[PDB]
Paper text:
SRs have a modular domain architecture consisting of a highly variable N-terminal domain, a DNA-binding domain (DBD), a short hinge region, and a ligand binding domain (LBD). Agonist binding drives a conformational change, whereby helices 3, 4, and 12 (H3, H4, H12, respectively) create a docking surface for coregulatory proteins termed the activation function surface (AF-H). Recent studies have utilized ancestral steroid receptors (ancSRs) to identify the molecular mechanisms that dictated the evolution of ligands specificity among SRs. Here we report the structure of the ancestral 3-ketosteroid receptor, [name] (ancSR2), the ancestor of the AR, PR, MR, and GR.
Attempts to determine the crystal structure of the ancSR2–mifepristone complex via ligand exchanged resulted instead in a crystal structure of ancSR2–progesterone with mifepristone bound at two surface sites. Despite highly similar crystallization conditions, addition of mifepristone altered crystal packing and reduced the number of monomers within the asymmetric unit from two to one. Surprisingly, Fo-Fc omit electron density shows clear evidence for the presence of progesterone within the LBP suggesting that mifepristone failed to exchange with this steroid hormone in vitro despite being in nearly 500-fold molar excess. However, initial Fo-Fc electron density clearly showed two well-ordered mifepristone molecules located at distinct surface sites on the receptor which we refer to as “site-one” and “site-two”. Site-one mifepristone makes extensive hydrophobic contacts along helices 3, 7, and 10 of the monomer within the asymmetric unit (AU) and with helices 9 and 10 and the C-terminus of a crystallographic symmetry mate. Surprisingly, a second surface mifepristone was bound to the interface of helices 3, 4, and 12, which is used to recruit coregulator proteins to drive transcriptional activation. Site-two mifepristone is coordinated by extensive hydrophobic interactions at the coactivator cleft with an interface surface area of 402.6 Å2. The C17-hydroxyl group of mifepristone makes a hydrogen bond with the amine group of the conserved Gln68. Our high-resolution structure reveals that indeed C20 is indeed oriented to accept a H-bond from threonine 210.
Residue numbers in the entry: -2 to 248
């Protein structure tokens, strides 16, 4: 309580932005865009793992819970942070994958996943509409890691549930700082948690494309780096068996 707030810790451990290493002089083509996003995903994946290990409460989970949460959440976390970066850097008009890999209309079209790009942009436009604050975002991003679990339950169910309640309490703390009335805070919590819930449907779409391009990678000439291959190969069978379920705030 005089302890450093959870928010101050989340601010301290928030990763720095990852560069794609993209050559912007190349023409916009499907396999160079998709292979480059996968190379970016590989670098963001090490960032995410490092961030997750520092997240207060996370290391108290069983190691199999930790790995499972990561497998189930990586796409959503990266998609959610992209919504944030697109909001802060382009007011939701473009997809800010990295400072050196920004998608405009032409690149979204050449990516072969135009509709999904639009999905991702709609998330960014909801950040813009709510004017999400940095403190809200960081709490929401933690909660997103804790929002897809095994149907069978986790090995550390009590520790997980306590951790989830602590991050929800911190999101409400971040909201109440603006010093609005209580009813306004309720509304804000509702809007932010709707935004979180809306990630699940987007992610399902993103997963469908990713899994397809993964299975067809040779024929499409779309490169998947080693760690991405590992996490997709692990996740794909569990999703197929329907082992994961979303934890929704709203029915
Ligand atoms: C209708 C139909 C059809 C299909 O021809 C079979 C699977 C489709 C694929 C599935 C999974 C899929 C998911 C999407 O969300 C957008 C499109 C999509 C497709 C299609 C597609 C077309 C081109 C690529 N490239 C070049 C990487 C990738 C996917 C159309 C696909 C191939
Ligand atoms: C082979 C294999 C495998 C996997 O089970 C799927 C994805 C792996 C992930 C890749 C992406 C990845 C990137 C890293 O930087 C270190 C580890 C790592 C992993 C794995 C992993 C192991 C332990 C944790 N903890 C305890 C937080 C987190 C991640 C091993 C993963 C999950
Ligand atoms: C090549 C491919 O299948 C695409 C479809 C969805 C794409 C991901 C969409 C979410 C995303 C956000 C980032 O900021 C890193 C790149 C990623 C992680 C994208 C990597 C390439 C993906 C996985």
């Amino acid at each position: 309580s005089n302890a450093p707030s959870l928010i101050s810790i989340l601010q301290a451990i928030e990763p720095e932005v990852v560069y794609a290493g993209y050559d912007n002089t190349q023409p916009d083509t499907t396999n160079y865009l998709l292979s480059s996003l996968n190379r970016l995903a590989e670098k963001q994946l090490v960032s995410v793992v490092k961030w997750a290990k520092a997240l207060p409460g996370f290391r108290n989970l069983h190691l199999d819970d930790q790995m499972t949460l990561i497998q189930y959440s990586w796409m959503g976390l990266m998609a959610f942070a992209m919504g944030w970066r697109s909001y802060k850097h382009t007011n939701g008009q473009m997809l800010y994958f990295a400072p050196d890999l920004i998608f405009n209309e032409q690149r979204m079209q050449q990516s072969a996943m135009y509709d999904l790009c639009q999905g991702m942009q709609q998330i960014s436009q909801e950040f813009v509409r709510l004017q999400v604050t940095q403190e809200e975002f960081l709490c929401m991003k933690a909660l997103l890691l804790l929002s897809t679990v095994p149907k069978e339950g986790l090995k550390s169910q009590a520790s997980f549930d306590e951790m989830r309640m602590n991050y929800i309490k911190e999101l409400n703390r971040a909201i109440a700082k603006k010093e609005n009335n209580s009813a306004q805070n309720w509304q804000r919590f509702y809007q932010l948690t709707k935004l979180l819930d809306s990630m699940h449907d987007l992610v399902g779409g993103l997963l469908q494309f990713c899994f397809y391009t993964f299975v067809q990678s040779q024929a499409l000439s779309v490169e998947f780096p080693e760690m991405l291959v590992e996490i997709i190969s692990a996740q794909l069978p569990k999703v197929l068996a329907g082992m994961a379920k979303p934890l929704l705030f709203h029915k």
